[PDB]
Design a protein around this ligand. Structure first.
Ligand SMILES: O=C1CC[C@H](N2Cc3c(ccc4c3OCC43CCN(Cc4ccccc4)CC3)C2=O)C(=O)N1
Ligand SMILES: [Zn+2]
Ligand SMILES: [Zn+2]
Lengths: 107, 27
């Protein structure tokens, strides 16, 4: 299926990975604490990403999940976040939220 | 442990210089 790639550059995910974590569809707008709006697409798996920092639950858009910033391994452009369950009774235990503007093609 | 923060995405750094490089990439 169609690959989604780093816009700046590297395949990051494919459309086959896309799922709806919550009922707001697979991609919705979320607001960060400083007024940046991120159209965040939820995919089960992503490749070619490096993580920055430790996981945090602060202002998590997906309650029960911690986020870790994720960037392109090639150009270091911000791509999204890895989300990791804080409890065992959640499913999935991990996924990625990718910001729409960081990916090509444009969805 | 990482007190320099990017308010666009939540990225945090130990070195101010790495925050500066990070911010540049958002442009
Ligand atoms: O699920 C997600 C993904 C991550 C995303 N975040 C979280 C986030 C984003 C941006 C900035 C921040 C932040 O939490 C801490 C901090 C806000 C509070 N700051 C407190 C602070 C300020 C100055 C010095 C030390 C600490 C740290 C950065 C973001 O896009 C978000 O809002 N939801
Ligand atoms: Zn890249
Ligand atoms: Zn950032």
């Amino acid at each position: 299926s169609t690959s989604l790639s780093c816009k700046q550059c590297t395949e990051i995910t494919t459309k086959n990975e896309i799922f709806s974590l919550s009922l707001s569809g697979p991609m919705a707008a979320y607001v960060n604490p400083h007024g940046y709006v991120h159209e965040t697409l939820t995919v089960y798996k992503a490749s070619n990403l490096n993580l920055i920092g430790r996981p945090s639950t602060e202002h998590s858009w997906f309650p029960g999940y911690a986020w870790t910033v994720a960037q392109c391994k090639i150009c270091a452009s911000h791509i999204g976040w890895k989300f990791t369950a804080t409890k065992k009774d959640m499913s999935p235990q991990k996924f990625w939220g990718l910001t729409r503007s960081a990916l090509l093609p444009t969805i | 442990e990482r007190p320099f923060h990017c308010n666009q995405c939540g990225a945090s750094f130990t070195q101010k210089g790495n925050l500066l490089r990070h911010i540049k990439l958002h442009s």
